[PDB]
Structure 1
Amino acid sequence: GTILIDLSPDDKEFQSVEEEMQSTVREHRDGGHAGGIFNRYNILKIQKVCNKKLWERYTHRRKEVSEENHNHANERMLFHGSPFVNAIIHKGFDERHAYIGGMFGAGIYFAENSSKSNQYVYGIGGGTGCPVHKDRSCYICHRQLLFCRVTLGKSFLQFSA
Structure 2
Amino acid sequence: KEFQSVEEEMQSTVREHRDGGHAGGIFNRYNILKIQKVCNKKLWERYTHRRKEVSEENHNHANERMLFHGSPFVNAIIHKGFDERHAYIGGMFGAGIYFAENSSKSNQYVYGIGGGTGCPVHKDRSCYICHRQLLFCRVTLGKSFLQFSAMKMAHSPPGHHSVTGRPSVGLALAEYVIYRGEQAYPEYLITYQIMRPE
User: TM-score of the superposition, structure 2-length normalised?
Assistant: 0.73
Residue 155 of structure 1 and its aligned partner are, at CA, apart by: 0.3
Going from structure 1 to structure 2, the CA distance change for 1:31 and 1:148 (only over 3 Å counts) comes to same
Instruction: Report how far residue 97 of structure 1 moved.
Output: 4.3
Corresponding residue number in structure 1 for 2:35: 46
What is the Cα deviation at residue 31 of structure 1?
Answer: 0.4
- Partner Cα separation in structure 1 for residue 103 and residue 67 of structure 2: 8
For 1:97 and 1:36, how far apart are their aligned partners in 2? 26
Aligned to 1:72: 61
Q: How far is 1:96 from its partner?
A: 4.4
Question: Does structure 2 retain, via aligned residues, the 8 Å contact 1:130–1:138?
Answer: yes
- Per the TM alignment, residue 101 of structure 1 is displaced from its structure 2 partner at its CA by 2.0
Structure 2 residues not aligned, in runs of 5+: 149-198
Contact in 2 for aligned 1:84/1:97 (Cα 8 Å): no
Give the drift of 1:100. Answer: 3.4
Alpha-carbon distance, 1:46 to partner: 0.3
Partner of 2:78: helix, strand, or coil?
helix
Find the residue that maps to 2:38 and give its secondary structure.
Answer: strand
Cα separation, partners in 2 of 1:97 and 1:77, compared to 1, 3 Å: farther
Encode CA deviations 1:100-146: one digit per residue, 9 max, x unaligned.
Answer: 32111110000000000000000001000000000000000000000
Q: Deviations over 1:15-62 (max 9, x none)?
A: 000000000000101000000000000000000000111000000000
Q: Tell me the C-alpha RMSD between the 2 structures.
A: 0.8
1:93 matched residue in structure 2:
82
1: CA distance, partners of 2:86 / 2:28: 28
- CA 1:48–1:147: 2 relative to 1, 3 Å: same
Task: Give the match for residue 164 of structure 2.
Answer: none
What is the Cα deviation at residue 95 of structure 1? 2.1
Structure 1 contact 98–109 (Cα < 8 Å) conserved:
no
Structure number having the greater helix percentage: 1
The alignment covers a number of residue pairs equal to: 148
- Whether contact under 8 Å (1:79, 1:113) holds in the other structure is yes
What is the rounded CA distance, in whole Å, between the counterparts of 1:49 and 1:97 in structure 2?
Answer: 21
CA distance in 1, matches of 2:111, 2:89: 16
Gaps of 5+ in 1: 1-11
Partner of 1:121: 110
Q: Distance in 1 between matches of 2:67 and 2:54?
A: 18
